[PDB]
RNA sequence: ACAUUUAACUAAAACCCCUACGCAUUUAUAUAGAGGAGACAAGUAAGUGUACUGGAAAGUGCACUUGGACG
RNA sequence: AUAGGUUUGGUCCUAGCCUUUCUAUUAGCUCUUAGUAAGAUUACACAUGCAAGCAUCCCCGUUCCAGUGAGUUCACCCUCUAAAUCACCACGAUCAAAAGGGACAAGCAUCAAGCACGCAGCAAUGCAGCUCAAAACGCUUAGCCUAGCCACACCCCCACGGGAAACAGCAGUGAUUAACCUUUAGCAAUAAACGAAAGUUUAACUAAGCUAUACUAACCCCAGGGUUGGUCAAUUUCGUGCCAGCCACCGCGGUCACACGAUUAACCCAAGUCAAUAGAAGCCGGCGUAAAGAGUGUUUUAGAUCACCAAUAAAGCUAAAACUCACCUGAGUUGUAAAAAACUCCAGUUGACACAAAAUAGACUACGAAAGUGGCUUUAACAUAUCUGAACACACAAUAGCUAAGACCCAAACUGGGAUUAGAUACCCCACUAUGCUUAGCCCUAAACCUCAACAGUUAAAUCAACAAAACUGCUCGCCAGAACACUACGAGCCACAGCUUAAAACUCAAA
């Protein structure tokens with residue numbers, strides 16, 4: 001572009017940053033509605049432990065439960081953070097271990 | 109690289125290199141010049157190189173250009189009193205035009221140094237305040253004075269917790 | 273729409289208006305129903321535009337291109 | 344950025360995503376001392392206690408301080424000039440309202456027109472004007488330009504009035520959020536209010552309390568967190584076997600797993616560590632083939648320095664070849680790899696005979712802005728002695744298509760018949776429509792391409808990623824910033840109504 005065109009257009013106008021599943025918040029509180037498992041997309045194979053949660057904002061979302069063995073049931077309270085599960089498409093929230101009902105992974 | 113011929117013109121150093129600071133009487137500067145004709149060559153250069161500097165040093169003076177309206181180039185300055193100053197610039201180089209306008213309507217170096225000294229007084233070195241305005245924030249930064257408790261804890265006798 | 277009284281051998285008292293807003297107007301939410309995109313999951317050269325046929329897959333007509341072939 | 348990882352069988356280029364750095368909040372785990380700084384998520388609702396007195400009565404103050412960030416170009420400069428302080432006799436300084444002039448945040452032009460937004464006159468009244476693609480009008484977002492400033496003080500902008508009964512003062516509480524400080528003391532200092540003054544009052548403030556949020560300094564015994572496949576510093580044994588599980592990106596896990604779990608050892612930081620979130624840091628680069636020169640030309644406000652042959656409109660005209668008609672002659676003609684259908688008012692010679700198309704020339708490379716233009720004659724006729732200049736303004740735009748009428752040789756979507764085929768809703772043969780033609784209107788799309796934007800200039804440099812078409816420079820307009828969603832949705836405009844122009848977002852991916 002020429003100098004006249006650059007002056008006409010002005011400084012670049014950067015689009016606003018997209019808000020993620022947590023909507024720009026570190027963590028979110030949620031109530032577990034149901035627990036289930038999902039299968040990875042296929043370079044891999046497993047049964048990933050997941051749960052649907054109604055967040056404090058009212059939106060329902062699918063979350064992954066990290067670690068070996070969880071004791072989450074319906075109506076329980078959990079704290080969910082960001083971070084995509086690379087194997088599960090559409091799962092962009094992760095349950096925080098050791099907060100509210102979701103306890104730490106049992107040793108061994 | 110930077111766009112356009114002579115990109116140095118679009119740097120703050122070049123813009124600040126000008127030496128023409130108009131007196132407060134000047135309000136408007138019209139520049140009538142011709143795009144073609146050897147006798148106007150300097151005037152064209154005067155438009156190309158020195159008008160940005162003049163405007164940079166004189167932000168409130170209205171500078172306006174006119175092209176191929178008269179057979180010869182000339183400058184006209186309008187003063188606050190209503191007087192008009194006509195400067196014929198045909199056959200003159202751009203440096204000559206700068207020197208002429210500086211001589212006839214430019215503040216001399218004495219006035220500029222006086223203004224700088226006046227600006228100096230506003231920033232009193234003894235005043236204490238934010239670094240944006242003062243050299244030092246607190247007297248505790250002065251050696252020999254009681255230092256800040258943030259860096260050196262005060263003796264227990266000087267603290268209210270152990271005076272109460 | 274609406275209006276100047278008392279008082280005055282020192283000087284004072286008195287003063288107060290009625291109308292709007294709705295079957296108007298703006299945007300948004302919920303809801304019947306309909307439809308998309310994504311994820312998962314599994315011989316007639318090639319095209320562009322346009323038109324018809326066909327339930328589709330595709331075929332054909334007209335003009336244009338080589339980003340094909342012609343030892 | 345001193346950069347690095349990641350597309351491919353491989354190389355180069357382009358391009359996104361991520362890594363390494365520094366902050367703040369929150370979460371997990373852990374946490375010794377001292378000093379200092381800082382300290383609800385919520386303009387939601389608030390129990391309780393304080394936060395404004397002074398003073399010989401009048402007045403003065405409670406319009407300040409303190410709080411919050413809901414709304415939002417009232418903050419800044421100049422002119423003029425109130426109130427206030429001091430001169431107080433004013434001359435005037437200081438300070439600073441109202442009024443006038445100027446300046447002043449971000450995103451969206453799919454918000455493009457606003458609809459009275461001006462001027463002149465003493466008025467009467469007259470003129471029809473004013474703003475706007477250099478962004479008016481409009482919607483959305485946000486306290487700001489921080490010695491501080493602006494705005495608000497429960498709501499109806501305001502507060503006569505109404506809803507109704509107010510902590511966005513300090514301490515504190517309920518609800519809510521990922522977000523969580525004591526219902527301390529004193530007016531000893533400074534500041535403010537009052538007083539003539541000694542002085543009095545103050546949840547301003549000062550001195551304390553709580554909190555790893557940060558900085559500084561320590562520590563007599565006292566260390567935790569994360570990581571160890573590459574980017575990127577650092578794994579020994581086992582357990583498990585595409586399961587359990589792990590990853591910021593690339594990826595690992597199928598019996599020898601440095602990538603999962605335990606364990607050993609090691610690496611980084613350290614009273615911290617670092618998981619999540621949000622910031623800090625960006626177009627002077629490009630447009631033949633990667634995104635981008637959007638079919639063609641003109642001009643406006645502006646910017647720049649480069650100041651005869653094949654055009655197109657009219658009118659006329661016709662040399663071949665068709666079709667149709669007539670005589671004469673023959674019984675077959677057509678169809679093809681081969682056949683069947685079809686015709687037999689068929690076929691051959693001769694003669695007459697278009698509103699269709701324009702061999703050879705043309706092995707030419709011309710005219711026109713492009714689209715296009717190639718039979719003959721004639722009349723009009725091919726802008727501009729600077730250049731650039733529009734998706735929308737003004738004009739045009741192959742083929743196809745839609746309205747009206749007309750012409751109809753040939754060709755031919757479609758539609759029938761014949762044949763083939765497992766089937767043929769195609770290919771082959773026959774017939775025949777819309778359409779190709781003229782007239783008057785529309786429609787406005789193409790691989791509308793030399794896939795090279797217009798003007799001016801250079802052949803010197805390493806010519807130069809590659810290929811295409813040798814490499815560049817100046818200047819201007821247009822356009823482009825990962826893929827797909829998407830020649831799409833919505834909005835707007837249109838003689839278009841299954842249409843054209845402009846043209847997104849959500850979800851998804853690490854590529855394309």
Ligand code: FES
Nearest residue numbers: 246247248256257
């Ligand atoms: S800043 Fe001066 S004593 Fe702290």
Ligand SMILES: [K+]
Nearest residue numbers: 043044045585
């Ligand atoms: K695998």
Ligand SMILES: [K+]
Nearest residue numbers: 397398403537
């Ligand atoms: K008083």
Ligand SMILES: [K+]
Nearest residue numbers: 412413414486
């Ligand atoms: K605010």
Ligand SMILES: [K+]
Nearest residue numbers: 414495500501
């Ligand atoms: K208000």
Ligand SMILES: [K+]
Nearest residue numbers: 530531532533
């Ligand atoms: K005091």
Ligand SMILES: [K+]
Nearest residue numbers: 581598599600
């Ligand atoms: K093993």
Ligand SMILES: [K+]
Nearest residue numbers: 337790792794
């Ligand atoms: K072409």
Ligand SMILES: [Mg+2]
Nearest residue numbers: 321322332333
């Ligand atoms: Mg076609």
Ligand SMILES: [Mg+2]
Nearest residue numbers: 348349358359
């Ligand atoms: Mg890269």
Ligand SMILES: [Mg+2]
Nearest residue numbers: 349350351593
């Ligand atoms: Mg590879």
Ligand SMILES: [Mg+2]
Nearest residue numbers: 370371616617
């Ligand atoms: Mg922590």
Ligand SMILES: [Mg+2]
Nearest residue numbers: 424425426427
């Ligand atoms: Mg006064």
Ligand SMILES: [Mg+2]
Nearest residue numbers: 417440441442
């Ligand atoms: Mg004012």
Ligand SMILES: [Mg+2]
Nearest residue numbers: 452476478735
């Ligand atoms: Mg525009």
Ligand SMILES: [Mg+2]
Nearest residue numbers: 453833834847
């Ligand atoms: Mg829209």
